[PDB]
Amino acid sequence: RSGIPVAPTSQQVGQMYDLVTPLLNSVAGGPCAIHHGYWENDGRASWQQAADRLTDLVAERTVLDGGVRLLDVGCGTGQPALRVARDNAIQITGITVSQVQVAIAADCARERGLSHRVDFSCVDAMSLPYPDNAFDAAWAMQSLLEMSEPDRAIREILRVLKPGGILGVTEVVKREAGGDRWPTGLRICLAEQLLESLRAAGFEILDWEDVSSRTRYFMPQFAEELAAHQHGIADRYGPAVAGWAAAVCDYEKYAHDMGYAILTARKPVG
Numbered sequence: 330r331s332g333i334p335v336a337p338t339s340q341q342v343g344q345m346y347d348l349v350t351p352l353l354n355s356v357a358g359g360p361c362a363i364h365h366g367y368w369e370n371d372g373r374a375s376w377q378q379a380a381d382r383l384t385d386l387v388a389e390r391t392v393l394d395g396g397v398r399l400l401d402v403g404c405g406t407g408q409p410a411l412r413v414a415r416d417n418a419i420q421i422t423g424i425t426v427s428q429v430q431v432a433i434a435a436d437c438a439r440e441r442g443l444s445h446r447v448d449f450s451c452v453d454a455m456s457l458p459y460p461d462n463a464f465d466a467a468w469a470m471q472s473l474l475e476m477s478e479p480d481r482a483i484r485e486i487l488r489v490l491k492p493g494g495i496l497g498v499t500e501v502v503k504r505e506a507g508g509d510r511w512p513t514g515l516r517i518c519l520a521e522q523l524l525e526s527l528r529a530a531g532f533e534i535l536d537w538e539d540v541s542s543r544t545r546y547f548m549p550q551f552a553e554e555l556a557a558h559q560h561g562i563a564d565r566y567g568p569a570v571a572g573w574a575a576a577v578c579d580y581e582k583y584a585h586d587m588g589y590a591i592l593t594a595r596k597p598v599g
Protein backbone atom coordinates (compact mmCIF):
# COMPACT_ATOMS: atom_id res chain seq x y z
CA ARG A 330 0.00 0.00 0.00
CA SER A 331 2.33 2.80 1.14
CA GLY A 332 4.96 4.22 -1.20
CA ILE A 333 8.18 6.20 -0.77
CA PRO A 334 7.64 8.58 2.14
CA VAL A 335 7.82 12.17 0.84
CA ALA A 336 13.62 18.07 1.18
CA PRO A 337 16.84 19.35 -0.43
CA THR A 338 16.45 20.66 -4.02
CA SER A 339 18.25 19.08 -6.96
CA GLN A 340 20.58 22.11 -7.02
CA GLN A 341 21.32 21.57 -3.31
CA VAL A 342 22.00 17.90 -3.87
CA GLY A 343 24.35 18.79 -6.75
CA GLN A 344 26.11 21.29 -4.52
CA MET A 345 26.56 18.72 -1.77
CA TYR A 346 28.14 16.30 -4.23
CA ASP A 347 30.25 19.14 -5.66
CA LEU A 348 31.65 19.61 -2.15
CA VAL A 349 32.08 15.97 -1.10
CA THR A 350 33.49 14.61 -4.37
CA PRO A 351 37.16 15.41 -3.71
CA LEU A 352 36.85 13.68 -0.30
CA LEU A 353 35.26 10.56 -1.80
CA ASN A 354 37.91 10.42 -4.47
CA SER A 355 40.62 10.77 -1.86
CA VAL A 356 39.16 7.99 0.28
CA ALA A 357 38.71 5.73 -2.77
CA GLY A 358 42.05 6.41 -4.46
CA GLY A 359 40.44 8.09 -7.50
CA PRO A 360 36.97 8.48 -9.08
CA CYS A 361 34.86 5.73 -7.53
CA ALA A 362 31.55 3.95 -7.30
CA ILE A 363 29.23 5.77 -4.89
CA HIS A 364 27.14 2.77 -3.93
CA HIS A 365 27.36 -0.09 -1.42
CA GLY A 366 29.47 -3.17 -2.02
CA TYR A 367 28.07 -6.68 -2.44
CA TRP A 368 30.08 -9.51 -0.89
CA GLU A 369 29.96 -13.26 -1.47
CA ASN A 370 31.55 -14.12 1.88
CA ASP A 371 32.41 -12.48 5.21
CA GLY A 372 33.56 -9.09 3.91
CA ARG A 373 36.98 -10.09 2.57
CA ALA A 374 37.05 -8.01 -0.67
CA SER A 375 37.71 -4.28 -0.57
CA TRP A 376 34.61 -2.11 -0.69
CA GLN A 377 35.68 -0.92 -4.14
CA GLN A 378 35.85 -4.49 -5.39
CA ALA A 379 32.48 -5.27 -3.80
CA ALA A 380 30.97 -2.15 -5.34
CA ASP A 381 32.15 -3.40 -8.74
CA ARG A 382 30.34 -6.70 -8.03
CA LEU A 383 27.13 -4.82 -7.40
CA THR A 384 27.60 -2.93 -10.65
CA ASP A 385 28.07 -6.23 -12.52
CA LEU A 386 24.91 -7.69 -10.98
CA VAL A 387 22.92 -4.66 -12.05
CA ALA A 388 24.36 -4.82 -15.58
CA GLU A 389 23.45 -8.52 -15.85
CA ARG A 390 19.83 -7.65 -15.15
CA THR A 391 19.58 -4.60 -17.40
CA VAL A 392 21.98 -4.82 -20.37
CA LEU A 393 20.32 -7.51 -22.40
CA ASP A 394 22.11 -7.05 -25.73
CA GLY A 395 24.73 -5.02 -27.55
CA GLY A 396 23.56 -1.89 -29.35
CA VAL A 397 21.12 -0.60 -26.75
CA ARG A 398 20.82 2.87 -25.25
CA LEU A 399 20.87 3.08 -21.45
CA LEU A 400 20.04 6.05 -19.15
CA ASP A 401 22.19 6.09 -15.98
CA VAL A 402 19.99 8.15 -13.63
CA GLY A 403 22.27 9.74 -11.07
CA CYS A 404 25.51 8.53 -12.52
CA GLY A 405 27.95 9.76 -9.83
CA THR A 406 31.48 10.14 -11.22
CA GLY A 407 30.56 7.69 -13.99
CA GLN A 408 32.71 4.86 -12.65
CA PRO A 409 29.98 2.16 -12.91
CA ALA A 410 28.94 3.34 -16.40
CA LEU A 411 32.53 3.23 -17.60
CA ARG A 412 33.03 -0.21 -16.08
CA VAL A 413 30.11 -1.58 -18.07
CA ALA A 414 31.03 0.37 -21.22
CA ARG A 415 34.50 -1.22 -21.30
CA ASP A 416 33.05 -4.64 -22.26
CA ASN A 417 29.66 -3.74 -23.78
CA ALA A 418 29.14 -2.02 -27.13
CA ILE A 419 26.25 0.13 -25.92
CA GLN A 420 25.49 3.80 -25.52
CA ILE A 421 25.14 5.14 -21.97
CA THR A 422 23.73 8.56 -21.25
CA GLY A 423 24.75 9.37 -17.64
CA ILE A 424 22.97 12.18 -15.83
CA THR A 425 23.74 13.85 -12.53
CA VAL A 426 22.90 17.17 -10.85
CA SER A 427 26.52 17.69 -9.83
CA GLN A 428 28.66 19.67 -12.31
CA VAL A 429 31.75 18.39 -10.52
CA GLN A 430 30.67 14.85 -11.32
CA VAL A 431 29.87 15.69 -14.95
CA ALA A 432 33.33 17.10 -15.44
CA ILE A 433 35.12 14.19 -13.72
CA ALA A 434 33.02 11.60 -15.55
CA ALA A 435 33.66 13.16 -18.97
CA ASP A 436 37.43 13.38 -18.32
CA CYS A 437 37.52 9.75 -17.19
CA ALA A 438 35.70 8.76 -20.38
CA ARG A 439 38.37 10.52 -22.40
CA GLU A 440 41.24 9.05 -20.41
CA ARG A 441 39.84 5.54 -20.78
CA GLY A 442 39.04 5.85 -24.47
CA LEU A 443 35.31 5.21 -23.89
CA SER A 444 33.69 8.52 -24.91
CA HIS A 445 32.24 6.81 -28.06
CA ARG A 446 30.05 4.74 -25.71
CA VAL A 447 29.40 6.98 -22.71
CA ASP A 448 28.51 10.63 -22.31
CA PHE A 449 27.58 12.67 -19.29
CA SER A 450 25.35 15.64 -18.67
CA CYS A 451 23.94 17.82 -15.93
CA VAL A 452 20.29 16.84 -16.00
CA ASP A 453 17.57 16.66 -13.34
CA ALA A 454 15.84 13.27 -13.42
CA MET A 455 12.58 14.88 -12.30
CA SER A 456 12.52 16.60 -15.70
CA LEU A 457 14.21 14.68 -18.49
CA PRO A 458 14.91 16.42 -21.81
CA TYR A 459 14.54 13.18 -23.75
CA PRO A 460 11.64 12.15 -25.98
CA ASP A 461 9.22 9.43 -24.96
CA ASN A 462 10.43 5.90 -25.72
CA ALA A 463 14.14 6.81 -26.15
CA PHE A 464 15.97 4.25 -24.00
CA ASP A 465 16.16 0.45 -23.93
CA ALA A 466 17.18 0.42 -20.27
CA ALA A 467 17.94 2.51 -17.25
CA TRP A 468 19.79 2.37 -13.94
CA ALA A 469 19.02 4.16 -10.68
CA MET A 470 21.79 2.95 -8.39
CA GLN A 471 21.16 4.78 -5.12
CA SER A 472 19.78 7.92 -6.77
CA LEU A 473 15.97 7.89 -6.39
CA LEU A 474 15.90 8.43 -2.65
CA GLU A 475 18.01 11.59 -3.01
CA MET A 476 15.35 13.28 -5.06
CA SER A 477 12.85 15.74 -3.62
CA GLU A 478 10.03 14.03 -5.54
CA PRO A 479 11.07 10.45 -6.37
CA ASP A 480 7.69 9.57 -7.81
CA ARG A 481 8.13 12.31 -10.38
CA ALA A 482 11.51 10.94 -11.43
CA ILE A 483 10.08 7.42 -11.59
CA ARG A 484 7.31 8.57 -13.97
CA GLU A 485 9.93 10.32 -16.13
CA ILE A 486 12.04 7.20 -16.37
CA LEU A 487 8.94 5.24 -17.40
CA ARG A 488 8.16 7.90 -20.01
CA VAL A 489 11.59 7.84 -21.69
CA LEU A 490 11.96 4.03 -21.60
CA LYS A 491 10.79 2.19 -24.70
CA PRO A 492 7.99 -0.32 -24.24
CA GLY A 493 9.52 -3.36 -22.60
CA GLY A 494 12.49 -1.27 -21.44
CA ILE A 495 14.15 -2.38 -18.23
CA LEU A 496 14.90 -0.34 -15.10
CA GLY A 497 17.35 -1.57 -12.51
CA VAL A 498 17.19 0.09 -9.10
CA THR A 499 19.38 -0.30 -6.05
CA GLU A 500 18.88 1.37 -2.79
CA VAL A 501 19.76 1.58 0.87
CA VAL A 502 16.51 0.83 2.73
CA LYS A 503 15.18 0.23 6.19
CA ARG A 504 15.52 -3.56 6.24
CA GLU A 505 12.19 -4.29 7.90
CA ALA A 506 9.16 -2.60 9.45
CA GLY A 507 10.40 -3.36 13.00
CA GLY A 508 11.00 -0.51 15.46
CA ASP A 509 12.50 10.69 8.30
CA ARG A 510 16.21 10.57 7.38
CA TRP A 511 19.17 8.42 8.33
CA PRO A 512 21.97 10.40 10.06
CA THR A 513 23.75 10.49 6.70
CA GLY A 514 20.86 12.55 5.38
CA LEU A 515 19.36 9.76 3.26
CA ARG A 516 15.53 9.48 3.25
CA ILE A 517 14.40 6.34 5.17
CA CYS A 518 12.37 4.02 2.98
CA LEU A 519 11.36 0.34 2.97
CA ALA A 520 12.09 -1.71 -0.16
CA GLU A 521 8.38 -2.53 -0.11
CA GLN A 522 7.64 1.22 -0.36
CA LEU A 523 10.03 1.64 -3.27
CA LEU A 524 8.30 -1.28 -5.03
CA GLU A 525 4.91 0.22 -4.51
CA SER A 526 6.02 3.59 -5.96
CA LEU A 527 7.44 1.83 -9.04
CA ARG A 528 4.24 -0.17 -9.56
CA ALA A 529 2.04 2.84 -9.01
CA ALA A 530 3.90 4.70 -11.75
CA GLY A 531 3.15 1.92 -14.26
CA PHE A 532 6.16 -0.38 -13.99
CA GLU A 533 5.88 -4.17 -13.97
CA ILE A 534 8.06 -5.57 -11.22
CA LEU A 535 10.25 -8.32 -12.60
CA ASP A 536 12.24 -9.04 -9.46
CA TRP A 537 13.13 -7.91 -5.96
CA GLU A 538 16.14 -9.34 -4.17
CA ASP A 539 16.79 -8.41 -0.59
CA VAL A 540 20.58 -8.50 -0.42
CA SER A 541 21.03 -6.88 3.00
CA SER A 542 23.11 -9.89 4.16
CA ARG A 543 25.59 -9.27 1.31
CA THR A 544 26.00 -5.52 1.73
CA ARG A 545 26.25 -5.22 5.51
CA TYR A 546 30.03 -5.05 5.36
CA PHE A 547 29.93 -1.73 3.55
CA MET A 548 29.32 0.85 6.28
CA PRO A 549 31.88 -0.54 8.72
CA GLN A 550 34.54 -0.91 6.03
CA PHE A 551 33.92 2.45 4.37
CA ALA A 552 33.90 4.19 7.79
CA GLU A 553 37.29 2.72 8.59
CA GLU A 554 38.62 3.96 5.21
CA LEU A 555 37.12 7.40 5.79
CA ALA A 556 38.59 7.63 9.28
CA ALA A 557 42.08 7.34 7.91
CA HIS A 558 41.38 10.47 5.73
CA GLN A 559 39.57 12.37 8.44
CA HIS A 560 42.16 14.88 9.53
CA GLY A 561 41.08 18.46 8.87
CA ILE A 562 37.94 17.49 6.94
CA ALA A 563 36.00 20.45 8.35
CA ASP A 564 38.72 22.97 7.44
CA ARG A 565 39.66 21.33 4.11
CA TYR A 566 36.24 20.33 2.63
CA GLY A 567 33.88 22.50 4.65
CA PRO A 568 31.57 21.94 7.58
CA ALA A 569 28.78 20.27 5.55
CA VAL A 570 31.18 17.58 4.48
CA ALA A 571 32.50 17.29 8.06
CA GLY A 572 28.97 16.72 9.36
CA TRP A 573 28.32 14.01 6.79
CA ALA A 574 31.70 12.37 7.55
CA ALA A 575 30.90 12.34 11.26
CA ALA A 576 27.54 10.60 10.53
CA VAL A 577 29.18 7.84 8.44
CA CYS A 578 31.68 7.19 11.20
CA ASP A 579 28.76 7.07 13.66
CA TYR A 580 27.31 4.09 11.68
CA GLU A 581 27.14 1.90 14.79
CA LYS A 582 24.18 3.97 16.00
CA TYR A 583 21.96 3.05 13.03
CA ALA A 584 23.46 0.86 10.31
CA HIS A 585 22.18 -2.36 11.85
CA ASP A 586 18.64 -1.20 10.86
CA MET A 587 19.69 -0.64 7.25
CA GLY A 588 19.35 -3.18 4.50
CA TYR A 589 19.66 -3.20 0.73
CA ALA A 590 17.45 -3.91 -2.31
CA ILE A 591 18.05 -4.77 -5.94
CA LEU A 592 14.87 -4.20 -8.00
CA THR A 593 14.25 -4.95 -11.70
CA ALA A 594 11.21 -3.41 -13.32
CA ARG A 595 10.04 -2.82 -16.86
CA LYS A 596 7.81 -0.61 -18.93
CA PRO A 597 4.89 -2.75 -20.15
CA VAL A 598 5.35 -3.96 -23.72
CA GLY A 599 3.45 -2.19 -26.49
Ligand SMILES: Nc1ncnc2c1ncn2[C@@H]1O[C@H](CSCC[C@H](N)C(=O)O)[C@@H](O)[C@H]1O
Nearest residue numbers: 362363364403404405425426453454470472
Ligand atom coordinates in the same frame (compact mmCIF):
# COMPACT_ATOMS: atom_id res chain seq x y z
N1 LIG B 1 17.40 14.99 -9.19
C1 LIG B 1 18.46 14.33 -9.62
N2 LIG B 1 18.64 14.15 -10.94
C2 LIG B 1 19.73 13.46 -11.43
N3 LIG B 1 20.66 12.95 -10.57
C3 LIG B 1 20.46 13.09 -9.24
C4 LIG B 1 19.37 13.78 -8.74
N4 LIG B 1 19.46 13.76 -7.39
C5 LIG B 1 20.58 13.09 -7.06
N5 LIG B 1 21.20 12.66 -8.19
C6 LIG B 1 22.47 11.93 -8.36
O1 LIG B 1 22.42 10.62 -7.84
C7 LIG B 1 23.72 10.16 -7.50
C8 LIG B 1 23.68 9.47 -6.14
S1 LIG B 1 25.20 8.59 -5.72
C9 LIG B 1 25.03 7.24 -6.88
C10 LIG B 1 26.00 7.39 -8.03
C11 LIG B 1 26.11 6.26 -9.05
N6 LIG B 1 24.82 5.73 -9.50
C12 LIG B 1 26.94 5.14 -8.50
O2 LIG B 1 26.41 4.04 -8.29
O3 LIG B 1 28.13 5.30 -8.34
C13 LIG B 1 24.61 11.39 -7.54
O4 LIG B 1 25.37 11.29 -8.73
C14 LIG B 1 23.63 12.55 -7.58
O5 LIG B 1 24.08 13.77 -8.17
